[PDB]
Automatic annotation (TrEMBL):
InterPro entries attached to this UniProt entry: Globin (IPR000971), Globin-like_sf (IPR009050), Globin/Proto (IPR012292), Mb-like_M (IPR044399)
Binding-site residues for heme b 8, renumbered to this chain: 38, 89
Binding site for heme b 3: 36, 89
Binding site for heme b 16: 89, 97
Binding site for heme b 4: 89
PROSITE patterns (alphabetical): GLOBIN
Binding of heme b 1, residues: 38, 55, 89
Protein name (database record): Dehaloperoxidase A
UniProt keyword list: Heme, Iron, Metal-binding, Oxidoreductase, Oxygen transport, Peroxidase, Transport
Amino acid sequence: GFKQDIATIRGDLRTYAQDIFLAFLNKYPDERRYFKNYVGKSDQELKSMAKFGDHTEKVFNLMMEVADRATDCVPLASDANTLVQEKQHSSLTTGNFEKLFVALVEYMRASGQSFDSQSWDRFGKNLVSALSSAGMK
Ligand code: HEM
Ligand SMILES: [C-]#N
């Protein structure tokens, strides 16, 4: 279930974070523009870069914190507020986050691993809702 999936992801966080983030960028290539350092680079070029792995690890660490702190896949308002108030998130709308969870759910369903993809879909939905409540346009 959802709780186990957090453990699955955390067990190999760097690998899953890079794979899912790439799945996001590749499904929605318009989103790559937000990430100047990643423009014009293949998956393998990005995986070779320590900074790319470090960035994706930090993002997915926090996502996993928000997921673990949630009750029944409903995230805490304070966590949504953190995400809205991140300086690097200033120009973003909830659609950016919606896209990320579409790609994440797609990745889980395509994977050989037994992810609770429906729970991640619900979690994504509830997070988008919470981002809006915290003031994200
Ligand atoms: C739940 C999902 C997300 C989480 C937990 C998250 C979290 C974070 C964190 C912790 C950082 C700082 C890490 C660092 O300095 O490298 C960061 C940076 C950033 N985030 Fe997110 N983020 C999420 C989704 C998104 C989305 C969907 C976008 C837009 C497509 C986005 C755009 C950015 C950008 C542009 C930066 C700065 C990257 C850079 O200049 O190196 N984030 N995010
Ligand atoms: C945020 N990536």
